[PDB]
């Protein structure tokens with residue numbers, strides 16, 4: 056129907072354009088550039104196929120996808136592959152899939168279809184989303200995956216922050232939970248774990264945080280014009296070579312990206328479209344402010360990549376498929 | 392239903408603004424911190440070693456420190472200007488070895504400038520620098536102690552292997568205060584491969600300097616006075632037929648009774664703290680750890696049998712409970728029958744009528760037999776009440792690791808089953824009344840001050856903060872009686888021949904402890920002694936000397952205190968010149 060928002064598509068295209076340009080120096084392995092190019096082809100073809108669907112059919116599979124995502128998060132801990140101390144991938148040769156992507160895209164639909172009704176703001180307002188969130192995070196902390204769990208909790212927080220808004224009861228609840236849980240984990244934490252957590256806060260410990268400290272010095276190399284990994288540190292490679300007048304260009308595109316995602320979230324009159332696009336833009340923007348915060352030496356290391364800018368076998372496809380659902384509910388914001 | 396989304400849009404907008412402001416900080420405000428000299432030079436990051444704190448006593452004499460260790464290493468075997476090096480080094484030849492080898496370890500401050508001019512910055516000749524803990528005025532190990540590198544279990548606690556962990560009695564207590572922050576730096580490396588500019592990213596804290604209450608003057612005399620006791624220990628054991636047992640098992644403590652500061656503490660057989668420190672793997676230190684004796688343990692804080700030193704507290708518990716007035720009448724007979732067996736006296740003839748002052752003087756044992764025989768079952772519990780009140784059961788507050796002093800009560804014997812004949816042996820100190828020389832020195836300091844029960848602390852000040860001494864008072868209605876009996880021991884009792892003609896009027900009490908092993912004539916040598924009982928312009932001082940199985944406290948421990956007391960008040964010997 057050609058009734059999309061081409062401004063959002065141009066912002067995504069401009070970011071993934073600089074991503075392929077930046078991967079020219081960051082890991083210049085031609086074998087890696089092949090698997091990244093064929094990932095963009097499938098990531099764009101899948102979004103083109105998701106446009107052959109209606110919004111009613113999308114939210115019709117909210118509970119099916121949520122129930123199926125819980126089956127994979129419980130199966131990944133059995134027949135999964137351990138890449139970095141955690142099993143969270145399904146690789147059967149030429150296949151590459153992560154169940155955490157289906158959990159996010161499944162929980163946003165399920166929590167939107169569910170919270171379209173009345174939330175009892177008295178006590179049981181948080182009861183329904185917590186009953187749907189803990190089974191997801193619970194099967195993620197048993198991988199373990201702390202970074203992916205924070206994206207889930209932040210997205211669920213965004214969904215509740217749009218419908219619920221228990222501002223007086225939510226902040227006091229967080230301040231209490233943020234003081235009772237550390238008061239219980241710190242005494243039961245081992246010295247191997249206590250120092251590990253303290254190193255996460257203050258990163259000045261070389262045998263583990265040398266590269267993460269080198270990132271702070273690597274970014275400040277060029278102005279006005281060996282790192283650990285390319286995936287978890289695309290920004291440091293890109294910020295080092297392009298100076299500061301460039302960094303504002305990447306921060307600008309991501310700033311304009313989260314703006315149109317929230318702007319298109321407002322154009323939708325339905326509440327479930329308000330919740331779905333808010334949680335998606337919340338989860339997407341949460342990784343960015345966390346990933347770029349790790350590189351700049353502000354946010355603690357969580358092990359997350361830059362969406363639409365990093366090297367991802369499926370993370371690019373899943374991020375594009377998520378944007379396809381964004382463009383889906385926007386052209387269907389009026390019709391029922 | 393829309394305003395909350397405007398807030399999230401504003402949130403991530405200000406979030407990316409803070410990141411942009413954070414980048415601008417590193418990019419613009421810190422570009423002078425990461426300059427690369429307009430060349431393809433890489434950047435290497437290295438951590439800065441932490442200067443451990445300096446341990447020094449009062450008056451400023453350094454006792455522990457750490458400086459550079461300059462060594463000469465060379466590989467290849469090129470002569471260079473060796474016609475000058477051979478006489479300077481005194482080797483007369485260059486031993487050609489394949490692996491890198493060290494020549495002249497510990498280059499002095501005079502040879503290093505002469506070597507530096509001859510180093511010429513060549514690839515073969517260089518001067519490696521190292522960090523090692525240096526003790527300019529070594530003090531007895533069991534008190535001072537040693538230093539080792541980070542253990543494998545300690546590495547997981549955030550310790551670098553180059554860091555130095557102190558198992559010492561004194562350096563473990565100060566370890567949280569001596570350790571400095573291991574900083575991190577980064578240096579621009581040229582394409583050739585040299586240092587260009589250093590960049591301090593984490594400033595290394597140089598640790599904190601601890602000021603001790605020990606006096607290096609009294610400390611030398613304390614360790615010295617332990618050795619002449621061996622000549623007295625071997626002399627005493629010679630009359631019994633036992634071997635010379637030349638080992639010097641014992642310790643000594645000298646402290647200020649007023650301010651609670653400890654001035655001299657030494658144990659034997661001590662070791663040299665410089666052994667474990669500077670040497671990578673000293674083979675002599677490995678034998679010290681596997682020693683059949685206890686060369687590392689501080690016998691000043693370990694529990695032993697106090698003997699006649701505990702009877703000073705028995706008299707305190709006897710006067711405060713109201714058992715005996717300060718002018719009671721008891722004849723120091725040679726023998727006393729408790730009811731089952733005969734309690735033996737240290738002597739063999741009748742001494743005469745005595746008081747509490749006279750009983751402490753001549754150290755009569757038959758006094759504490761008749762007096763306790765009145766109420767032997769209830770006094771034992773009240774005895775430990777006053778005993779723990781004087782500082783014999785609880786800790787002394789020392790920074791060094793201290794052992795538990797056991798005081799016997801009726802409740803303790805039930806959990807260990809009590810017999811009435813045990814009280815008399817407990818009254819003198821036989822019934823497992825385990826005490827430590829540190830706790831023993833505190834008990835005398837309480838009676839010397841007449842009520843004040845100060846806390847023993849080696850540290851006078853950490854960094855620059857003067858540590859205030861904590862006091863505590865005990866309810867004592869008759870203090871002078873004990874103080875008079877203590878000097879009556881020096882004036883007329885056991886210490887008559889050593890300290891009778893002594894210039895400073897001293898008081899104290901001798902002590903021997905029938906060892907539980909065989910009771911064959913080699914008791915534990917004990918003697919306590921506090922400072923000027925009279926208003927004589929001499930600073931107060933308490934000294935307590937102990938020797939394992941040394942025997943004859945009047946012959947071994949008593950002269951050991953005379954030596955330390957003479958060193959404190961500056962008592963001249965045969966110096967007619």
Ligand SMILES: *C(=O)[C@@H](NC(=O)[C@H](N)c1ccccc1)[C@@H]1N[C@@H](C(=O)O)C(C)(C)S1
Nearest residue numbers: 698699702737754885901902903904944945
């Ligand atoms: C303690 O109050 C007295 N007796 C003992 O220490 C021992 N029970 C003892 C050892 C050897 C012979 C007889 C008794 C005094 N402690 C000694 C001392 O003051 O040095 C004493 C033997 C002279 S008497």
